[PDB]
Amino acid sequence: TGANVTFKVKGTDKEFTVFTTRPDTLFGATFTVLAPEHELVDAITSSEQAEAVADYKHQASLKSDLVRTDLAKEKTGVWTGAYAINPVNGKEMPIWIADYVLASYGTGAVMAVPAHDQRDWEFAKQFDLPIVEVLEGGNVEEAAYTEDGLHVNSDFLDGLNKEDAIAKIVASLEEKGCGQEKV
């Protein structure tokens, strides 16, 4: 039981969809990550970033799934040169490629929530990216908080728990056709 969320690419007519198990953390998504092998990558990569993106894709194709999803391995990646638009508030989120996202699982794209996902937190720490708390109970600057808590910094989701918030955001994204529940 997860959800699909669709993001527009700024300044283009392109879109991608991510698979998320925590659509309730949408207001804490500070960047997005595509698998280096994702089909959209070449289309949205800027000319300044083209060669670095090509180099990283080659490096990534030489690593197995197991090696890539290994928690202990240093996070790596490169900015595509593009930005995604958060449907709930129009906020820009830089689009990165990174090998800890796998092409074959879900859609091959994620929304990164460094405050509440360990791998995303490690990436943000490696690359000096913003970390935004959306569930209280932890100290997200020092460690990802992966448990239940009341929602904050999340507009209409404020004060709800995981169950209630997921139900509300999913129902709200469906209304707009920016997302739906998915198995």
Ligand X SMILES: Nc1ncnc2c1ncn2[C@@H]1O[C@@H](COP(=O)(O)O)[C@@H]2O[B@-]3(OCc4ccc([C@H](O)c5ccccc5)cc43)O[C@H]21
Binding site for ligand X (CB under 6 A): 19-22, 25, 35, 101-102, 105-106, 108, 110-111, 113, 116-117, 146
Pair of tokens at residue 12: 């283009």
Q: How far apart are CA 68 and CA 86, in angstroms?
A: 27
Q: Which residues of 39-75 are buried (b: 16+ CB within 10 A; e: fewer)?
A: ebbeebbeeebeeebeebbeebeeeeeeebeeeeeeb
Provide the minimum distance between the beta carbon of 48 and ligand X in the complex, in angstroms, as a whole number. Answer: 26
Provide the minimum distance between the beta carbon of 111 and ligand X in the complex, in angstroms, as a whole number. Answer: 5
Looking at beta carbons only, is 148 or 158 nearer to ligand X?
148
Looking at beta carbons only, is 13 or 142 nearer to ligand X?
142
Looking at beta carbons only, is 50 or 170 nearer to ligand X?
170
Provide the minimum distance between the beta carbon of 13 and ligand X in the complex, in angstroms, as a whole number. Answer: 24
Q: How far apart are CA 45 and CA 94, in angstroms?
A: 12
Looking at beta carbons only, is 51 or 148 nearer to ligand X?
148
Closest alpha carbon to 99 in 130, 133, 143, 68: 68
Provide the minimum distance between the beta carbon of 38 and ligand X in the complex, in angstroms, as a whole number. Answer: 9
